[PDB]
Design a protein around this ligand. Structure first.
Ligand code: NI
Length: 341
C-alpha cells in the first residue's frame, strides 16, 4: 500500500510509486529519476502511462524494457498539460535525467516535488521565481547540521590533481573508479580527460552511459579495457581483495592501482578537510574515499527552503522513525521563525 507522501492530492497522480501494484485512482505515474529505490517495481509488463524526462525514458526502454507506447517523455522548463493538469519539469541537479515536478492544481494550489536534488542558488532563477508554492515534498536526506561536505568542483579538483600526480610519477599505474548506479559520472570523466585516456568498462555499464545524452560520449568511453588507463568497476569490488584480483587480469601492463570510492557523506567529514584527505594503502594499492554528493548539504537545503517560503513541508526521506521526523520538524520551524514566513 502506497504511502501518503507519494500521492498528489486533487489529481490522479503518484510520484515514484511503482512497487505497490495498481494504485487505486492513479491515471499517470511520474518517475523523478532512474535510481532503484524510486523505480522499484517497473518492468516490460508495466501497462500504465509513465511520465519522465527524455533521459529517464531512454533508460526505461533500454535497461528495464518498458514498452515504448507507455513512455511519455517531457521536455524541461516547458509548461505541459497531463490529464487536464498543468505540470513543469525542472533540473534537480542530482543524476542524469533527474527532475523536480511543479504541479498547478485545478483549485489554485501549487505543489513542488523535489524528487532527489542538490539545491543550488541557480534554482532561484528558474521558473520557480514566478509564483508561490503551497506544498513542498522535500528530499531531506541530509537534514541535520552535522552533514557538511565540499562543492562538487572542489572534490573534482582534488581527484584530478591526485590522479595526474600519481600517473606522472608512475606511468605504469592504473586508475580505478567505483560505480553502482548512474550519477557521479564527472569523477571518472574528469580524471580520464586529464590523463588523455578513454574510460574502460563492462558492456552493461557502457549501455547505461549510452542512454544519458552526454555530448561527444563516443570520444570519452570504451569497452576495450586494454586500450584505457581509467577503469570502472562495481563499487563492491573497491577493496584490497577485489583490486588485487583485477590487477592480475591486466596481463602485467600495470604495477600499481590508485582507486576512488565516491561516497556520500561519511563521519570522516566531521574532522578532515578535503585538502587533508589521505588514502588507505596496502602494498601497491591505494583507495581514496571522496565526499562527492548529489544531495543537498544541510546549509544548501536551508537556503533553498528559506528562499521558497512554502506554506507546508512534507519530507520524503528519513520518514521511518519518530526521532528523525521530530528532528526534521524542529529544523523546519527554526527556519521559518528565522526568515519570518
Ligand atoms: Ni537518487
Amino acid at each position: 500500500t502506497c504511502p501518503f507522501y507519494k500521492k498528489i492530492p486533487g489529481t490522479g497522480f503518484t510520484v515514484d510509486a511503482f512497487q505497490y501494484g495498481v494504485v487505486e485512482g492513479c491515471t499517470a505515474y511520474f518517475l523523478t529519476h532512474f535510481h532503484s529505490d524510486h523505480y522499484a517495481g517497473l518492468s516490460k509488463h508495466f501497462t500504465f502511462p509513465v511520465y519522465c524526462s527524455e533521459i529517464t525514458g531512454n533508460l526505461l526502454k533500454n535497461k528495464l524494457h518498458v514498452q515504448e507506447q507507455y513512455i511519455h517523455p517531457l521536455p524541461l522548463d516547458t509548461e505541459c498539460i497531463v490529464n487536464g493538469v498543468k505540470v513543469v519539469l525542472l533540473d534537480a541537479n542530482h543524476c542524469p535525467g533527474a527532475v523536480m515536478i511543479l504541479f498547478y492544481l485545478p483549485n489554485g494550489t501549487v505543489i513542488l516535488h523535489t524528487g532527489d536534488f542538490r539545491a543550488d542558488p541557480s534554482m532561484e532563477r528558474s521558473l520557480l521565481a514566478d509564483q508561490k508554492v503551497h506544498m513542498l515534498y522535500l528530499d531531506t536526506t541530509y537534514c541535520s547540521p552535522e552533514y557538511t561536505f565540499p562543492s562538487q568542483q572542489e572534490v573534482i579538483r582534488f581527484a584530478i590533481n591526485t590522479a595526474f600526480e600519481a600517473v606522472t610519477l608512475n606511468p605504469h599505474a592504473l586508475v580505478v573508479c567505483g560505480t553502482y548506479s548512474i550519477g557521479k559520472e564527472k569523477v571518472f570523466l574528469a580524471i580520464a580527460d586529464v590523463l588523455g585516456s578513454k574510460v574502460g568498462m563492462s558492456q552493461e555499464k557502457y549501455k547505461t552511459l549510452q542512454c544519458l545524452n552526454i555530448p561527444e560520449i563516443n570520444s570519452l568511453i570504451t569497452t576495450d579495457m586494454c586500450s584505457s588507463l581509467v577503469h570502472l568497476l562495481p563499487m563492491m569490488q573497491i577493496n584490497f581483495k577485489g583490486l588485487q584480483s583485477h590487477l592480475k587480469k591486466c596481463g602485467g601492463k600495470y604495477n600499481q592501482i590508485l582507486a576512488f570510492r565516491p561516497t556520500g557523506w561519511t563521519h570522516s567529514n566531521k574532522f578532515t578537510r578535503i585538502a587533508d584527505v589521505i588514502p588507505q594503502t596496502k602494498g601497491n594499492i591505494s583507495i581514496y574515499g571522496i565526499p562527492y554528493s548529489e544531495h543537498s548539504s544541510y546549509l544548501e537545503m536551508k537556503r533553498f527552503v528559506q528562499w521558497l517560503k512554502p506554506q507546508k513541508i512534507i519530507p520524503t526521506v528519513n520518514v521511518g522513525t519518530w526521532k528523525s521526523r521530530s528532528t526534521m520538524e524542529k529544523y523546519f520551524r527554526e527556519w521559518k521563525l528565522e526568515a519570518g514566513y
